[PDB]
């Protein structure tokens, strides 16, 4: 869970200048760090960030010695991110005129990690190096660095302005590749990112993540067969974990505010009635029948809790998707560390899959939960297999509405040309590509990989308000609109079919 | 279909209605009263805004607007309630029969023309809009006027007039010692004379069984959740209606009553500052949120502006193969999309073309959905839905589009990694046998909500002052005994073949 990140940057003059046609590398690094810190602040994962810079006239390190380990300042030690850090990076971070070797920067970062790590359970440690590799490399202590890094289990990542470079930059890239190969080997070549690539990924706030509670029960078929199972929630409509707090417009405090409820009778005198003399009731047609809460509990429907029973087995065709109810989808696995339960559940899943059948079951979360009737159907993948449970309707929840038929309606019978235009439209706006080599469908517009725009908007507005207290809210970011819209190719291809459809179909607003 | 259903219960009060052919059997009057009470209870539960009335003919007393003779209007057209059921409950037995005879009287003459006139007059008094008008005639006399031909002609003329006005007449014939012959007189009065309803009936009509079948589920009339605009492009727009064919049924909300007289009490919530103690309008407060050891303050209007993305409607995005859709990606109950020609003319043709070609090409229309204002967009897939009819030509699957909500990345969750242990073919075969033994046919209306049914039973018992509440049979409970009988030794063989000798699943 916890993770300590030591961002080691540089402020050397070598980045203060660059080609005017592109943004300076220093600006790119600043933007990357700002985006990362924003994500950490608005994703409360309890991770910690420390900030070190090498290439500044100041000298503040735990280890000084002689000329070595100089020109390096530990700007910010290891604590939880806060808006003060964002302000610091906004102004305090300033360029410089001196150079330095990124090896010493790595040494000081490792020293800071080692010194401050004790006392906390930080299970992961990442150090990110932002350097242009313009300065010379004092390769004289590589072996000890590698030994220490492997002993301490510390990960290292690099960020460069390039994915037409000077020979010194080439030498820097070579030494970096050597270090990464020593640390991890081949895969390390994928841990060196560029500024454009990093800015691509860090433009979206971290998605709201919650942990599902493991729900144990026993799947029963009859009165003698039982399989120990654990259920988790796979799909649910996510909501913000924090809610707005009403505050007083002047003192800006919630302690000076509180709500009250007043009950009164149906009379001109407007008599006041206390909460200890209000009974519960219902309306039975044209009258009202008292029904106290105590008697309601006495006469309530009482059921044994935590039931997962198999009412029966039905063909998959008889259970249709349009009838699914509820607000959640459950994934049912065998109980953890139980081989017998795993074998039993695998047998049931495979049997149902082979016979093309699903299990109609009864579900009750606990004693206080209303009973439910649902469908459990098999889900077999190349690595994992399980049951998937979704609720099914009752008699009272079904609505019998009658609608006129359009196929045999003389008034609204389409012609051949209209149908051809619609066919052309459907073929032009295809959102899936059929690769013939693999004969496979590729999704051009995957909706399940788009973060909820609502949380993006909320966090953007909150951040803008925190950093600009007196200012109107901004508009929706362009990239949000881009990720809620289809790729430009689909829009480009669909213009002519749409014009044809407009021509053939008369539509008159009324 | 707009308005309310109006129903009038005509009950004969002649002598022949108060005699029991067998010792252990119900008199026609008792059967009629039971049916009336059952319909009253069904209406209270299902449609509480409908109008019901109860009239008697053949009595000695009279009570009507026209001051006719031998016609007692017991209850004029009004919404159902417990008081009326209790009022009818005093004629439910032999002592109730004596009470009815004392209060009103029986065994007198009558004219069907006057009875139908009183029923029509009752219909006229209603000031609401009535979608249906119905009269049910509970009688066991097939020839009410055999001696007088003029009365028969008057009754025929009045029945014809009532039919012209738009009043349905139904005959619920009860058991007669000699048998009931509709052929004699009631053919002309009845609204519809079925071909099979011509032979002499020696037993009460089959409609009484349906009347006594209590309906305890709310029946909601057709209604559109929203009328939206489907926008294929900035210029091509059609009008659609969104409906919900599946909606969760909830208990009616409780009301707060005063204990000393059972009169409703109204509630009001207000917020006042601690120091001054005065009321604070909603305009004198702000909103706050803590993040990164800081307090962020926003006004309410901005808080609502945070949610504004696009105007209400459906925006087309493209078309997707139906294979890419997944069944385990369920997020929210699906909706129904149908054309609507009231707002835009020509929508039906384009909708039909899209439906036909989507069915032919097996594709679903991907769209961005914003139901109301100030609601962030969701992604929906419109899956074509063809028209499917059952044997009796009653439509069971309407034509249109099924709107299915697709999840965002935040709506899914990560599962703990679990090693897979596959089953050998023998275990799968034994479990296949077990599955095949417990096969059954499933229908969407094969189960009832135990909680709601018990709630309605309890409410009825409390209202009508019954001895004990009726207990509902829970069909969701497994039939353990039958399953054990059917499976036989399969369970033991499977347990031997899949579980070690010392496993103890319970522990």
């Amino acid at each position: 869970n916890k993770a300590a990140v030591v961002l080691c940057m540089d402020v050397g003059f070598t980045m203060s200048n660059s080609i005017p046609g592109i943004e300076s590398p220093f600006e790119q690094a600043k933007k990357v760090i700002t985006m990362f810190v924003q994500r950490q602040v608005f994703a409360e994962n309890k991770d910690e960030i420390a900030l070190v810079l090498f290439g500044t006239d100041g000298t503040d390190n735990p280890l000084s010695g002689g000329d070595q380990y100089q020109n390096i300042t530990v700007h910010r030690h290891l604590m939880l991110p806060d808006f003060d850090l964002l302000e610091d990076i906004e102004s305090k971070i300033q360029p410089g005129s001196q150079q330095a070797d990124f090896l010493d920067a790595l040494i000081v970062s490792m020293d800071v990690i080692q010194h401050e790590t004790i006392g906390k359970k930080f299970e992961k440690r990442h150090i990110e190096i932002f350097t242009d590799l313009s300065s010379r490399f004092s390769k004289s202590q590589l072996d000890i660095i590698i030994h220490s890094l492997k002993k301490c289990d510390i990960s290292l990542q690099f960020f460069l302005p390039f994915s037409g470079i000077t020979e010194q930059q080439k030498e820097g890239l070579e030494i970096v590749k050597m270090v990464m190969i020593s640390l991890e080997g081949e895969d390390g070549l994928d841990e060196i990112y560029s500024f454009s690539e990093s800015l691509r990924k860090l433009c979206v706030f971290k998605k709201i993540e919650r942990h599902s509670i493991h729900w144990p029960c026993r799947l029963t078929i009859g009165s003698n067969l039982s399989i120990r199972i654990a259920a988790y929630k796979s799909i649910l409509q996510e909501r913000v974990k924090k809610t707005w707090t009403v505050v007083d417009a002047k003192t800006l405090k919630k302690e000076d505010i509180q709500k009250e409820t007043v009950y009164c009778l149906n009379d001109d005198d407007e008599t006041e009635v206390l909460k200890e003399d209000i009974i519960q009731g219902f309306r039975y047609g044209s009258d009202i029948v008292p029904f106290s809460k105590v008697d309601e509990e006495q006469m309530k429907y009482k059921s044994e809790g935590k039931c997962f029973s198999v009412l029966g087995f039905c063909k998959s065709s008889q259970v249709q998707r349009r009838f699914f109810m509820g607000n959640q989808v459950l994934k049912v696995f065998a109980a953890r560390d139980d081989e017998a339960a795993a074998v039993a559940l695998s047998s049931l899943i495979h049997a149902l899959d082979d016979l093309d059948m699903v299990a109609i079951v009864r579900y009750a979360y606990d004693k206080r939960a209303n009973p439910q009737v649902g469908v459990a159907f098999p889900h077999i993948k190349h690595n994992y297999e399980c049951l998937v449970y979704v609720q099914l309707p009752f008699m009272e929840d079904l609505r019998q509405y009658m609608f006129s038929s359009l196929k045999n309606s003389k008034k609204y019978a389409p012609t051949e040309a209209q149908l051809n235009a619609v066919d052309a439209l459907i073929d032009s706006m295809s959102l899936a590509k059929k690769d013939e080599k693999t004969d496979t469908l590729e999704d051009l517009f995957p909706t399940t990989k788009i973060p909820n725009p609502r949380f993006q908007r909320l966090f953007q507005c909150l951040l803008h308000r925190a950093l600009h207290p007196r200012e109107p809210l901004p508009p929706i970011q362009q990239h949000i609109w881009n990720m809620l819209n289809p790729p430009a190719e689909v829009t480009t291809k669909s213009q002519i079919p749409l014009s044809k459809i407009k021509t053939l179909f008369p539509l008159i607003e009324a | 279909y707009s308005g309310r259903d109006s129903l009038i219960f005509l009950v004969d009060a002649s002598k022949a209605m108060f005699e029991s052919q067998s010792e252990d059997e119900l008199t026609p009057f008792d059967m009629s009263i039971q049916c009336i009470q059952s319909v009253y209870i069904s209406k209270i539960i299902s449609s509480d805004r409908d109008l019901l009335a109860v009239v008697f003919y053949g009595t000695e007393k009279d009570k009507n607007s026209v001051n006719f003779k031998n016609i007692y209007v017991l209850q004029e057209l009004d919404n159902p309630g417990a008081k009326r059921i209790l009022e009818l409950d005093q004629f439910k037995g032999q002592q109730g029969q004596k009470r009815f005879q004392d209060m009103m009287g029986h065994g007198s003459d009558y004219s069907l023309s006057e009875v139908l006139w009183v029923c029509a007059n009752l219909f006229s008094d209603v000031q609401f809009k009535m979608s249906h008008k119905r009269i049910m005639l509970f009688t066991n006399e097939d020839n009410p006027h055999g001696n007088d031909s003029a009365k028969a002609s008057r009754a025929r003329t009045k029945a014809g007039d009532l039919r012209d006005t738009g009043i349905f007449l139904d005959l619920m014939h009860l058991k007669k010692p000699g048998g009931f012959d509709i052929s004699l007189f009631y053919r002309d009065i009845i609204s519809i004379a079925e071909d099979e309803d011509l032979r002499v009936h020696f037993e009460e009509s089959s409609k009484l069984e349906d009347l006594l079948r209590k309906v305890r589920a709310k029946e909601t009339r057709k209604r559109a959740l929203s009328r939206l605009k489907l926008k294929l492009n900035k210029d091509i727009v059609i009008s659609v209606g969104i409906y919900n064919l599946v909606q969760k049924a909830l208990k009616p909300p409780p009301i707060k009553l005063y204990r000393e007289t059972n009169e409703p009490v109204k509630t009001k919530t207000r917020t006042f500052n601690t120091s001054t103690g005065g009321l604070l309008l909603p305009s004198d407060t702000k909103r706050s949120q803590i993040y990164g050891s800081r307090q962020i303050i926003l006004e309410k209007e901005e808080t609502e502006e945070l949610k504004r993305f696009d105007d209400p409607g459906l925006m087309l995005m493209g078309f997707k193969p139906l294979v890419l859709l997944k069944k385990h990606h369920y997020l929210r109950p699906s909706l129904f999309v149908y054309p609507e020609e009231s707002l835009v003319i020509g929508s039906s043709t384009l909708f039909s073309a899209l439906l036909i070609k989507c069915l032919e090409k097996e594709v679903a229309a991907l769209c961005r959905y914003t139901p109301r204002r100030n609601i962030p967009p969701y992604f929906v897939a419109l899956v074509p839905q063809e028209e499917e009819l059952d044997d009796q030509k009653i439509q069971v699957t309407p034509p249109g589009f099924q709107l299915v909500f697709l999840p965002f990345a935040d709506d899914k969750r990560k599962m703990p990694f679990t090693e897979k242990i596959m089953a050998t073919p023998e275990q799968v075969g034994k479990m296949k046998a077990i599955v095949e033994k417990l096969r059954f046919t499933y229908r969407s209306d094969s189960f009832e909500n135990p909680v709601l049914q018990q709630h309605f039973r309890n409410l009825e018992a409390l209202a009508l002052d019954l001895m004990e509440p009726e207990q509902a049979v829970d069909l969701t409970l497994p039939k353990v005994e039958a399953m054990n009988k059917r499976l036989g030794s399969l369970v033991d063989e499977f347990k031997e073949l899949v579980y070690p000798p010392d496993y103890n699943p319970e522990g």
Partner: peptide, 23 residues
């Protein structure tokens, strides 16, 4: 028209809930 409700006109007479009826 066929199989219409005698209590609520305009609605089809729902068949009673049958639960599980094994074949």
């Amino acid at each position: 028209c066929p199989g219409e409700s005698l209590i609520n006109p305009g609605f089809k007479s729902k068949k009673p809930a049958g639960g599980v009826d094994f074949d």
